[PDB]
């Protein structure tokens, strides 16, 4: 699977989760940012590696970071 | 691979034994066969015009395979097609070259199998080990002494073949 | 040429049997799981 | 010129080199 | 599911990508699962012994195939007229016209004519018969077996070297300088003095008589008295016929200089004295480092103490010792940069100063050897920068390298890269502009208007070495000079004869075309360096991707965000610079080959007038010399250049096929493949057969590599077919 | 990544002072700066003389003048050592 | 490897299929050889009538 | 029973059993068949020179190639003499030339190649080398041809009186 990380520079804008086509990311409560929430990745096995979450990230360096790793049928986007 | 009867197994020992007994027969038979000139047009060099570029050899004289060598090769091709058909589609009773993955490997014969005068497996293995050694003995004897392998076969048996 | 028979004997073996056999074995090894 | 026996000696030594190559490749592969 | 046994991430991939990536990552032992440093260095050691053996099997094969199928004994009788045979052809696809067309070389069978020069090398070093070429082939088969057994043996538990052994820098340097470089150069002098020198003079010396045949008539008594100049007395006369006793001297060590007048090669006594000098020098250099007896240098102490007190290098080389030793990629990069420069020296010095008898009249061999070693040079130099990029990504620790030369190179990475960008642009704009100026003016019927700039600096260098063509009267060219007077008694008479004579490639005449092409090569070397340096320096990060190090050396991209990040990895700058390497070695070998074929005709002025504009390069080099090559077969027959005629088209095909992988990218191909997966599953009588691995399109990085390989292979095969067939067909 | 070995007796030679410590001179660490400066001038004169007397090189050069001609580059390292020793108070 | 051989998509069944395919293919090739050798029209491309 | 014309190896096997364990041949006899085979190769390459000189003479403008004649002499004629001298050495002194006195060295302290019954043929071949070179300098095509023929007769005579044992081994 791919490995998806969220760094503590996340402002909790929820945009990376909305971008996610594969329900990899979700919002959890976090007191670090003003929004009271940070992104989380409890479903990186469904991560295809599209990196749409990275594009939606408005932080200077993407708080969400996809690291392409081992490929599976799910992470390869194979309908066969 | 090894779990199918391939490698240094008694199945391989038996199969190479069968091939070496046949090979000793074939070497004796071709020695007798070309000693009396019973291979037709043995020296006749095959023409590339009929057979194509597979017939070329590059020997300075003739530049082609001889008819004798082609005939022995065609005999070998006959038993190779038998070999492939027996390997992939064996008989119901025949021993198979590639044993099923889950099989019981036959016990190794040891230094000497028990002697049975009939058409037994033990007799096959003894003769097969002797014939494989015999193939090495003739091939080395011919190599060492600078004689044709047909000639050393004839010399060992006291020139009975020719 | 001395041993002129050897190019006729080896070039088809090395050029057809060798790849065929090693491709067959390589195919079996890459596909196999255990 | 090279004899057929000389070519056979070269083929023997290259077979010994092939066996040592197999043994090194199996050792490197573990 | 178990083929990449070194990679569980690939061995669980259900696609065809697993096979490709397991094949492509096989030799990257550092990335293998559960890899310790002990096991890494011990597998590299054993696989280095396997490379040693492959080289020896390759050399034994060349010797065996020439001893068996070549015409070496016919060639050594008459080396200027007989064409050397590489090996015979047994091809069952040949027609009888093809069999007849390849039956040259004085033999009765089809053959390839050797362009490798091995006949000239084996002739020069002593080999006379097929029996000793075969004996060399046998000895190399034995050595290949010895090094295969050594590779297996040093994988055995008691014989496994420790990491302390693998990083003993001082003992390895002492032994490689004094034993591997120096003593084997000294032993090579012994081979020349004991074997090659007597057999160049007609006297056979083999293992059968070499302990009872003295190389010198006096014989090891002048050496053990200090009367060393007695070994230079009575050199080979100018009447010497190589291989025979007529005109032969008795000297075994000389500094005559220039070339043997018949073979047009360097004197073998000069070569024997060269390896004796360079041997003693390297042996002395191999006593530099401290190993076990308290004398010598510690490499750590030398590197730590070389920080200039002005502070301009920062901490200097503090910590460079550890970085080098711990980083196999830093070592590979130093080794490959060093080796790439040498094989460029090999290419440049072997055409201008040939060492082999009757080569430099084998124009095909000279062209093939130069082209071969320059392409090897470009590959080694690009790989050196590649492994410097891999070093920065994988092995470079900034904390261990604080304010070093390495940190301070990264600190000004933008000054380095922007000034390489400037010099590349500078040279490119002007060199192309002058070339286009020349093309436009010549096209407009005004060749005089061409901007032709004389290569005065290089001509001054030629004159400084004694060329009298330009009338500089500098150093050696001036008869009454300190430099000229000093070498007059030793090497200058021969060198002046060699340089001034126009029969050799030593300091070939240079004019405006030479200037323009040298500037083109400067643009190419600077631009390949720009791409490679930009890749190495930005390997660990950039403004576009700050955390690039975390992704590795070879990754596809960071996605379409931040504007687009295609070809952002350091591997992708290797990929892009590989085209620039091919382009520069193209410019170098096109220049070398065109200048040499024009000189070899006796028509050097045709290069002098046509090389200053690009249509001269197109019509007078590529189009004019294509005609023997592309007529290797036609509807009127074929000749022995048909194979190069077929290879030339084959190179054009591979090269163009590479464009498919480089222009068309993955999403198109994955959508094709999904329709093929549908079609196979829906086709009756065919859906009985199922793939074990799901067919996927090639990866982004993999297709860049596949297109690069196809581009490169097409480049090599096209040019090799051209440089060999045009020179063979023309013979001049 | 693993301990990198160095020969026994390897000591620290990194310096940021005016001159390196005399330990960078190895076996010449105890030589006075006057002794290096005099050896440096002596080596420069004898090396330059021995070099000069065999500038037209013959097939019979004097081996002592060849060996003595090696003192000219050796004199360079000698005066660098002289500078290091004077700036260490030696 | 499974005990059942009644289907092609089994190890034993595909081995039986391969066995049959070899015997059939060599026999069919032989049958074609016998027929073409015996019949002159088959030796030509259908131009024997012409 | 004889030595191959080109490769020079033993040709046919034809208690003095040829097989290695039972071989009755000495290492001296095996060295003698090696030397005799080398003599055979060098002597059988004399027709090649004769053919080349005939091609040179029948050309439209004929010139003797001193380089070819001298290089052939250096490659084969000098080799033929050295092989014959070694056979004479082994015939005269005996086992000592086979390594019985040690490594080949100066002052080997063994009976010379001269004083051998077969040495006179070696003198004939040495005269042939001198004639081949003298004719090549002179430009005399016929001289090279006859001189090579003299060498060929001498080498064949050497082998006939030598009666070398052929060790197939
Ligand atoms: C294939 C079976 C076979 C047969 C039928 C023979 C038959 C014969 N061999 Mg024997 N022999 C055999 C195998 C065989 N051999 C083997 C396997 C070898 C080892 C390579 C030999 C080695 C051998 C030698 C060395 C000689 C014979 C000879 C002979 C012939 C006459 C003298 C005699 O009785 O020798 C006694 C029988 C034996 C020694 C073996 C039984 C005789 C017809 C002689 C002959 O005329 O050869 C030219 C002879 O000198 N044989
Ligand atoms: C590695 C160098 C090398 C190369 C490139 C070749 C190339 C060739 N050889 Mg071989 N050969 C070599 C060494 C080599 N030879 C050596 C050292 C010997 C002495 C034993 C021979 C003996 C030999 C014979 C007797 C014949 C050839 C022939 C041929 C030709 C057809 C191929 C064939 O039948 O191979 C057969 C070759 C062998 C059975 C010997 C093994 C060759 C080497 C030792 C293998 C080394 C492999 C390499 C180092 C790495 C392998 C891995 C690689 C795939 C990455 C071809 C031109 C045939 C020929 O001339 O036709 C025109 C032929 O009949 N070769
Ligand atoms: C590199 C080595 C090599 C060699 C030695 C050959 C040899 C041959 N090829 Mg070539 N071929 C090769 C590579 C090679 N091929 C490659 C790489 C390609 C693709 C570009 C081709 C494409 C090609 C075509 C398109 C044709 C040939 C043909 C031929 C045959 C020559 C014509 C003749 O006399 O017909 C006489 C030929 C025969 C009587 C056929 C003999 C059949 C053999 C002996 C049976 C072998 C059993 C098989 C190998 C089992 C292997 C199983 C596997 C595990 C290895 C001959 C068998 C022609 C042909 O097939 O001939 C009919 C032909 O039409 N070849
Ligand atoms: C005298 C002692 C000695 C010698 C001879 C060697 C020799 C070698 N060692 Mg070393 N080694 C030694 C002691 C020694 N070792 C010690 C003491 C240690 C422990 C501290 C090591 C530790 C060590 C390691 C860890 C490794 C080696 C390796 C090697 C091999 C280098 C690969 C190669 O082919 O380069 C050959 C290089 C040359 C012949 C010189 C290069 C010539 C330059 C580049 C240009 C000259 C061009 C010239 C004209 C040549 C022309 C050729 C002709 C065609 C014209 C080489 C055989 C490596 C290897 O491959 O393992 C087997 C390796 O990994 N060694
Ligand atoms: C007049 C404005 C200007 C100035 C002062 C510079 C200054 C510099 N540029 Mg250039 N550059 C400019 C415009 C300018 N740039 C433009 C418009 C482009 C896009 C084509 C570039 C592209 C560019 C590259 C690609 C490179 C530089 C480099 C450099 C540096 C080396 C000097 C050199 O060789 O120039 C070289 C100049 C060029 C290659 C392009 C010239 C572009 C035209 C001629 C100038 C534009 C005129 C502008 C419209 C004036 C309008 C003002 C008017 C309204 C009053 C230096 C910092 C090099 C560097 O980093 O080396 C240290 C380098 O590699 N520049
Ligand atoms: C003929 C083919 C060609 C040409 C000319 C170039 C040109 C260049 N390449 Mg490219 N490249 C090519 C093929 C080519 N490449 C290929 C096939 C590859 C493989 C992918 C690469 C990969 C590559 C990389 C990876 C790099 C380059 C770099 C460079 C520059 C190197 C020379 C330089 O710095 O200044 C020379 C400048 C020129 C030759 C430009 C010509 C000047 C123009 C034509 C002025 C004309 C004005 C005119 C009025 C325009 C009319 C337009 C009309 C519509 C009005 C330059 C822009 C490097 C770079 O940018 O360094 C700074 C770099 O990093 N190239
Ligand atoms: C030009 C470069 C250079 C420099 C600056 C030095 C400098 C030095 N060397 Mg080194 N050396 C060099 C090249 C160099 N060497 C080379 C090329 C060799 C190989 C012959 C050696 C082999 C060598 C040995 C074997 C030893 C030195 C030693 C020394 C020290 C001697 C001081 C002295 O003579 O006291 C007055 C000094 C630090 C000694 C020392 O202690 O090393 C640190 C020592 O034992 N040198
Ligand atoms: C410690 C080892 C040693 C020593 C000091 C000697 C000493 C000597 N040997 Mg002996 N030798 C030895 C081992 C040794 N040998 C071994 C193991 C062999 C068997 C390979 C030989 C085989 C041998 C022969 C065949 C000859 C000598 C000769 C000599 C003399 C030196 C001249 C010469 O050619 O050397 C050669 C040295 C070697 C071959 C050793 C390797 C001298 C008495 C020569 C002589 O005149 O004999 C007195 C002579 O012809 N040696
Ligand atoms: C890339 C590669 C992979 C893994 C890592 C690696 C190991 C380091 C590397 C090395 C690869 C290497 C080094 C590969 C080396 C490959 C080699 C050397 C192959 C040699 C093959 C020789 C053959 C088959 C000759 C057989 C002769 C015969 C049967 C003659 C027999 C006989 C005749 C007729 C006469 C005598 C009697 C008999 C015995 C009867
Ligand atoms: C990218 C990368 C990252 C970090 C790690 C890394 C691997 C190290 C690195 C790679 C770096 C790489 C790949 C570096 C490549 C570096 C290269 C190729 C350096 C070339 C150096 C050549 C020199 C200094 C020639 C000097 C000639 C002279 C002085 C001749 C003098 C003369 C003589 C004697 C004779 C003639 C007269 C004159 C002219 C006077
Ligand atoms: S987008 Fe970047 S910032 Fe907005 S939530 Fe997802 S991670 Fe946190
Ligand atoms: S990569 Fe595509 S899938 Fe994986 S997390 Fe970012 S958005 Fe969701
Ligand atoms: S195009 Fe291919 S490479 Fe360029 S960004 Fe999108 S994915 Fe990465």
Give B-chain residues touching E108 at CB under 8 angstroms.
58, 60, 63
Half-sphere exposure of E184 (CA within 13 A, CB side): 6
Chains E and H touch (3+ CB pairs under 8 A): yes
What is the Cα–Cα distance from E370 to E364, expressed in whole angstroms? 10
Give D-chain residues touching C22 at CB under 8 angstroms.
none
Q: How far is residue E129 CA from its own chain's centroid? A: 30
Helix, strand, or coil (residue B33): helix
Could you tell me which of E133, E196, E596 has the C-alpha nearest to residue E361? E596
Secondary structure element (H or E) that encloses residue E163, with its range: helix E163-166
**DSSP code of residue B66:** B
Instruction: Judge contact between E63 and D10, C-beta under 8 A.
Output: no
Instruction: Judge contact between B107 and B10, C-beta under 8 A.
Output: yes
The method recorded for this entry reads cryo-EM
- Dihedral (CA of E328, E331, E333, E336) sign: negative
Q: Is the CB of E388 under 6 A from ligand 10?
A: yes
Could you tell me which of F80, F88, F79, F90 has the C-alpha nearest to residue F18? F88
Would you tell me how many other CB atoms lie within 10 Å of the CB of residue F48? 15
Answer yes or no: is E660 a known binding residue.
yes
Could you tell me which of E572, E532, E575 has the C-alpha nearest to residue E556? E572
**Which of E73, E210, E246 is the closest to H70 by Cβ?**
E246
User: F55-61 long-range contacts, Cβ below 8 Å, gap at least 24?
Assistant: F55/E482, F55/E485, F55/E486, F56/E485, F56/E486, F56/E488, F56/E489, F57/E486, F57/E487, F57/E489, F57/E490, F58/E489, F58/E490, F59/E229, F59/E232, F59/E233, F59/E489, F59/E490, F60/E229
Judged by its nearest atom, the ligand closest to the C-alpha of residue E55 is 2
Helix, strand, or coil (residue A29): strand
What is the Cα–Cα distance from E571 to E705, expressed in whole angstroms? 10
Helix, strand, or coil (residue B22): helix
Residue A50 in contact with partner chain E when CB distance is under 8 A? yes
Could you tell me which of E46, E4, E7, E8 has the C-alpha nearest to residue E23? E4
- E638 backbone dihedrals φ, ψ, rounded to 5°: -150, 160
Q: What is the 3-state secondary structure (H, E, C) of H19-63?
A: CHHHCCCCHHHHHHHHHHHHHHHHHHCHHHHHHHHHHHHCCCCCC
**Which residues does E657 contact at the CB level (< 8 Å), separation at least 6?**
E710, E714
Q: For residue H4, what is the nearest residue in chain B, using CA coordinates?
A: B146
Give E-chain residues touching C34 at CB under 8 angstroms.
1-2
Protein residue whose Cα sits closest to atom 32 of ligand 1: B158
What is the Cα–Cα distance from H14 to H20, expressed in whole angstroms? 16
Q: How far is residue F10 CA from its own chain's centroid? A: 20
Secondary structure element (H or E) that encloses residue A39, with its range: strand A37-40
The pair of structure tokens assigned to E92 is 């069952």
Could you tell me which of E630, E629, E642, E627 has the C-alpha nearest to residue E97? E642
Q: What is the 3-state secondary structure (H, E, C) of E68-98?
A: HHCCHHHHHHCCCCCCCEEEECCCCCCCHHH
- E451 backbone dihedrals φ, ψ, rounded to 5°: -85, 95
Chains H and B touch (3+ CB pairs under 8 A): yes
C-alpha angle H4-H7-H8 in degrees, rounded to nearest 5? 50
What is the Cα–Cα distance from E616 to E63, expressed in whole angstroms? 42
Q: Is the CB of E662 under 6 A from ligand 10?
A: no
CA of F40 to the centre of ligand 7 (A): 15
The pair of structure tokens assigned to B148 is 């044709």
The pair of structure tokens assigned to B33 is 């066969």
Instruction: Judge contact between E638 and E688, C-beta under 8 A.
Output: no
**Which of B146, B151, B152 is the closest to H10 by Cβ?**
B146
Half-sphere exposure of F32 (CA within 13 A, CB side): 3
What is the Cα–Cα distance from F42 to G25, expressed in whole angstroms? 97
What is the Cα–Cα distance from E30 to E37, expressed in whole angstroms? 8
Radius of gyration in angstroms for the set of CA atoms belonging to chain H, rounded to a whole number: 18
Secondary structure element (H or E) that encloses residue E493, with its range: helix E492-500
C-alpha angle H79-H83-H89 in degrees, rounded to nearest 5? 145
Give D-chain residues touching C1 at CB under 8 angstroms.
none
What is the Cα–Cα distance from E126 to B8, expressed in whole angstroms? 47
Instruction: Judge contact between E670 and E696, C-beta under 8 A.
Output: yes
From E91, E92, E96, E653, mutation site for ligand 3 pocket: most ligand atoms within 8 A of C-beta: E92
> Alpha helix locations (H) across E25-129?
37-69, 72-77, 96-101, 118-124
Beta strands in E622-725 (DSSP E): 633-634, 637-638
Q: Which atom of ligand 1 is nearest to the CA of H17?
A: 25
The pair of structure tokens assigned to E508 is 């070939």
Could you tell me which of B69, B73, B65, B72 has the C-alpha nearest to residue B48? B65
Bridge partners, residue A4, by sequence: A66
Could you tell me which of E171, E634, E613 has the C-alpha nearest to residue E432? E613
**Which of B144, B147, B151 is the closest to H20 by Cβ?**
B144
What is the Cα–Cα distance from E594 to E585, expressed in whole angstroms? 14
Q: How far is D22 from chain B (nearest CA, A)?
A: 15
Helix, strand, or coil (residue A28): strand
**Which residues does H96 contact at the CB level (< 8 Å), separation at least 6?**
H110, H111
Bridge partners, residue E694, by sequence: E15
Count of all residues that appear for chain G in the document: 50
Answer yes or no: is E668 a known binding residue.
yes
Helix, strand, or coil (residue E297): strand
What is the Cα–Cα distance from E20 to A71, expressed in whole angstroms? 13
The pair of structure tokens assigned to E54 is 């492959």
Q: Is the CB of E54 under 6 A from ligand 2?
A: yes
CA of E667 to the centre of ligand 13 (A): 10
What is the Cα–Cα distance from D16 to D22, expressed in whole angstroms? 10
Beta strands A64-67 and E85-88, pairing class: unpaired
Could you tell me which of E341, E301, E351 has the C-alpha nearest to residue E321? E301
Give E-chain residues touching F60 at CB under 8 angstroms.
229
Q: What is the 3-state secondary structure (H, E, C) of E674-716?
A: HHHHHHHHHCCCCCCCCCCCECCCCCHHHHHHHHHHHHHHHHH
Protein residue whose Cα sits closest to atom 38 of ligand 3: B54
In this complex, do E211 and H68 lie within 8 Å of one another by their Cβ atoms? no
Q: Is the CB of E330 under 6 A from ligand 10?
A: yes
Bridge partners, residue E297, by sequence: E289
Ligand 1 site: residues with CB under 6 angstroms?
Answer: B 155-160
Q: Is the CB of E349 under 6 A from ligand 4?
A: no
Count of all residues that appear for chain E in the document: 732
Q: Is the CB of E179 under 6 A from ligand 4?
A: yes
Give C-chain residues touching B57 at CB under 8 angstroms.
4-5, 7-8
What is the Cα–Cα distance from E416 to E391, expressed in whole angstroms? 18
Q: How far is B150 from chain E (nearest CA, A)?
A: 26
Give B-chain residues touching E92 at CB under 8 angstroms.
52-54, 56
In this complex, do B65 and C8 lie within 8 Å of one another by their Cβ atoms? yes
Q: Is the CB of E560 under 6 A from ligand 13?
A: yes
Protein residue whose Cα sits closest to atom 37 of ligand 3: B54
**Which residues does E317 contact at the CB level (< 8 Å), separation at least 6?**
E303, E304, E306, E307, E404, E405
Secondary structure element (H or E) that encloses residue A3, with its range: strand A3-6
Residues of A within the annotated binding site for [4Fe-4S] cluster?
Answer: 10, 13, 16, 20, 47, 50, 53, 57
Helices and strands counted in chain D (H then E) = 1, 0
Cβ-Cβ contacts under 8 Å between B and D: the total is 3
Residues of A within the annotated binding site?
Answer: 10, 13, 16, 20, 47, 50, 53, 57
Instruction: Judge contact between E167 and E97, C-beta under 8 A.
Output: no
Chain breaks in chain C (C to N over 2.5 A) after: none
Instruction: Judge contact between H132 and H1, C-beta under 8 A.
Output: no
The pair of structure tokens assigned to E340 is 């790439």
What is the Cα–Cα distance from E464 to E459, expressed in whole angstroms? 8
* C-alpha distances out from residue E403 to A50, E307, E399, F18, Å: 39, 11, 9, 19
């Amino acid at each position: 699977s791919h490995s998806v990380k969220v760094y503590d520079t996340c402002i909790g804008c929820t945009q990376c989760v909305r971008a996610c086509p594969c329900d990899v990311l979700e919002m959890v409560s976090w007191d670090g940012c003003k929004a009271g929430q940070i992104a989380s990745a409890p479903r990186t096995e469904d991560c295809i590696g599209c990196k749409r979450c990275e594009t939606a990230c408005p932080t200077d360096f993407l708080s969400v970071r996809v690291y392409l790793g081992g490929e599976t049928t799910r992470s390869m986007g194979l309908a066969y | 691979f090894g779990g199918r009867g391939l490698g240094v197994t008694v199945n391989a020992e038996r199969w190479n034994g069968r091939h070496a007994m046949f090979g000793i027969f074939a070497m004796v038979m071709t020695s007798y066969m070309k000693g009396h000139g019973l291979i037709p047009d043995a020296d006749k060099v095959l023409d590339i015009a009929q057979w194509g570029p597979l017939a070329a050899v590059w020997d300075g004289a003739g530049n082609g395979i001889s008819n004798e060598r082609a005939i022995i090769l065609i005999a070998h091709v006959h038993v190779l097609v038998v070999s492939v058909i027996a390997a992939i589609a064996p008989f119901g009773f025949q021993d198979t070259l590639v044993k099923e993955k889950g099989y019981t490997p036959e016990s190794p014969a040891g230094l000497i199998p028990p002697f049975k005068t009939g058409l037994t497996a033990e007799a096959e293995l003894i003769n097969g080990r002797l014939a494989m050694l015999g193939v090495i003995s003739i091939v080395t004897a011919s190599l060492f002494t600078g004689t044709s392998v047909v000639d050393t076969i004839n010399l060992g048996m006291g020139k009975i073949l020719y | 040429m001395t041993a002129a028979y050897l190019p006729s004997i080896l070039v088809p073996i090395i050029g057809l049997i060798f790849p065929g056999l090693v491709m067959a074995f390589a195919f079996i090894y890459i596909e196999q799981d255990e | 010129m090279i004899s057929d026996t000389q070519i056979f000696i070269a083929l023997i030594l290259a077979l010994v080199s092939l066996v040592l190559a197999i043994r090194l490749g199996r050792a490197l592969y573990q | 599911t178990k083929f990449p046994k070194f990679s569980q991430a690939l061995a669980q991939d259900p696609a065809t990508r697993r096979i490709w990536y397991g094949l492509a990552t096989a030799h990257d032992l550092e990335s293998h699962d559960g890899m310790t440093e002990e096991n890494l260095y011990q597998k590299i050691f054993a696989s280095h012994f396997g490379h040693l053996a492959v080289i020896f099997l390759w050399t034994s094969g060349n010797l065996f195939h020439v001893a068996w199928q070549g015409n070496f004994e016919q060639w050594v009788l008459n080396p200027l007229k007989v064409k050397p045979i590489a090996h015979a052809i047994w091809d069952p696809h040949f027609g009888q016209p093809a069999v007849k067309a390849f039956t040259k070389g004085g033999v009765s069978y089809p053959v390839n004519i050797a362009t490798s020069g091995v006949y000239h090398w084996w002739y020069t070093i002593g080999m006379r018969s097929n029996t000793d070429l075969y004996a060399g082939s046998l000895f190399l088969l034995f050595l290949a077996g010895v090094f295969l057994f050594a590779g297996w043996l040093h994988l055995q538990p008691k014989f496994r070297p420790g990491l302390s052994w693998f990083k003993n820098n001082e003992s390895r340097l002492n032994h490689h300088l004094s034993g591997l470089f120096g003593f084997s150069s000294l032993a090579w002098s012994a081979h020349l003095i004991h074997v090659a020198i007597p057999e160049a003079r007609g006297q056979h010396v083999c293992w059968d008589n070499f302990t009872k045949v003295a190389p010198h008539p006096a014989g090891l008594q002048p050496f053990f008295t200090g009367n060393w100049g007695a070994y230079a007395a009575s050199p080979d006369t100018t009447n010497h016929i190589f291989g025979t006793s007529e005109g032969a001297g008795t000297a075994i060590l000389t500094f005559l200089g220039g070339f043997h007048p018949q073979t047009q090669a360097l004197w073998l006594t000069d070569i024997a004295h060269h390896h004796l000098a360079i041997g003693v020098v390297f042996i002395f250099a191999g006593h530099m480092y401290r190993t076990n007896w308290g004398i010598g240098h510690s490499l750590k102490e030398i590197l730590d103490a070389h920080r200039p007190p002005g502070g301009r290098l920062g901490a200097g080389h503090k910590g460079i010792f550890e970085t080098l030793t711990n980083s196999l990629h830093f070592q590979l990069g130093l080794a490959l940069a060093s080796l790439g420069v040498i094989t460029s020296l090999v290419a440049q010095h072997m055409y201008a100063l040939p060492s082999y008898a009757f080569i430099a009249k084998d124009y095909v061999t000279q062209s093939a050897l130069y082209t071969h070693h320059q392409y090897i040079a470009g590959f080694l130099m690009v790989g050196a920068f590649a492994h410097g990029a891999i070093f920065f990504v994988r092995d470079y620790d900034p904390e261990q390298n604080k304010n070093n030369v390495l940190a301070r190179i990264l600190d000004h990475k933008e000054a380095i890269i922007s000034h390489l960008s400037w010099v590349s642009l500078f040279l490119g704009f002007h060199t192309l502009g002058i070339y286009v100026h020349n093309d436009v003016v010549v096209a407009f019927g005004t060749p005089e208007k061409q901007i032709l700039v004389e290569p005065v600096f290089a001509q001054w260098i030629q004159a400084s070495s004694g060329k009298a063509l330009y009338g500089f009267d500098v150093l050696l060219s001036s008869t009454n000079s300190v430099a000229a007077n000093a070498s007059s008694n030793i090497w200058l008479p021969g060198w002046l004869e060699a340089i001034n004579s126009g029969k050799n490639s030593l300091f070939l005449p240079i004019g405006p075309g030479d200037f323009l092409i040298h500037h083109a090569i400067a643009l190419a070397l600077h631009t390949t360096t720009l791409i490679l340096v930009k890749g190495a320096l930005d390997a660990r990060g950039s403004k576009l991707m700050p955390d690039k190090k975390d992704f590795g050396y070879a990754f596809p991209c960071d996605g379409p965000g931040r504007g687009g990040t295609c070809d952002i990895s350091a591997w992708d700058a290797f990929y892009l610079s590989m085209f620039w390497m091919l382009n520069t070695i193209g410019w170098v070998t096109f220049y070398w080959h065109w200048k040499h074929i024009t000189i070899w005709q006796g028509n050097a002025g045709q290069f002098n007038e046509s090389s200053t504009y690009i249509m001269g390069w197109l019509r007078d080099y590529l189009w004019l010399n294509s005609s023997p090559l592309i007529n290797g077969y036609n509807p009127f027959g074929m000749n022995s250049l048909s194979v190069w005629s077929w290879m030339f088209l084959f190179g054009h095909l591979i090269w163009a096929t590479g464009f498919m992988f480089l222009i068309s990218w993955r999403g198109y191909w994955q959508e094709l493949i999904e329709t093929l997966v549908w079609a196979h599953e829906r086709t009756p009588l065919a859906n009985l057969v199922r793939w074990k691995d799901k067919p996927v399109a090639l990866s982004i990085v993999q297709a860049r590599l596949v297109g690069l390989i196809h581009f490169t292979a097409g480049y090599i095969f096209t040019y090799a077919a051209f440089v060999i067939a045009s020179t063979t067909g023309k013979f001049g | 990544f693993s301990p990198v070995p160095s020969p026994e007796g390897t000591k620290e030679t990194y310096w940021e002072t005016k001159a390196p410590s005399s330990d960078v001179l190895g076996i010449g660490a105890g030589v006075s700066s006057g002794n290096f400066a005099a050896a440096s001038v002596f080596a420069a004169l004898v090396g330059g003389y021995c070099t000069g007397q065999v500038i037209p090189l013959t097939v019979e050069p004097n081996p002592l003048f060849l060996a003595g001609s090696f003192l000219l580059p050796y004199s360079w390292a000698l005066h660098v050592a002289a500078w290091i020793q004077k700036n260490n108070g030696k | 490897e499974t005990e059942a051989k009644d289907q092609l998509q089994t190890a034993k069944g595909w081995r039986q299929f391969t066995s049959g395919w070899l015997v059939g293919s060599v026999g069919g090739a032989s049958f074609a050889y016998i027929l073409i050798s015996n019949i002159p029209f088959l030796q030509t491309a259908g131009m024997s009538m012409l | 029973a004889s030595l191959d014309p080109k490769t020079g190896f033993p040709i046919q096997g034809g208690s003095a059993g040829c097989q290695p364990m039972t071989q009755a041949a000495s290492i001296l006899d095996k060295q003698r068949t090696v030397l005799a085979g080398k003599i055979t190769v060098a002597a059988n390459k004399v027709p090649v020179l004769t053919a080349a000189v005939d091609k040179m003479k029948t050309a439209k403008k004929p010139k003797l190639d001193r380089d070819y004649v001298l290089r052939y002499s250096a490659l084969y004629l000098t080799t033929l003499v050295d092989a014959m001298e070694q056979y004479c050495l082994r015939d005269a002194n005996g086992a000592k030339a086979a390594g019985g006195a040690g490594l080949p060295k100066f002052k080997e302290t063994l009976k010379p190649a001269s004083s051998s019954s077969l040495y006179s043929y070696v003198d004939t071949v040495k005269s042939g080398i001198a004639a081949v070179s003298a004719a090549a300098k002179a430009g005399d095509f016929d001289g090279v041809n006859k001189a090579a023929g003299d060498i060929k007769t001498a080498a064949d005579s050497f082998l006939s009186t030598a009666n070398p044992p052929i060790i197939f081994n």
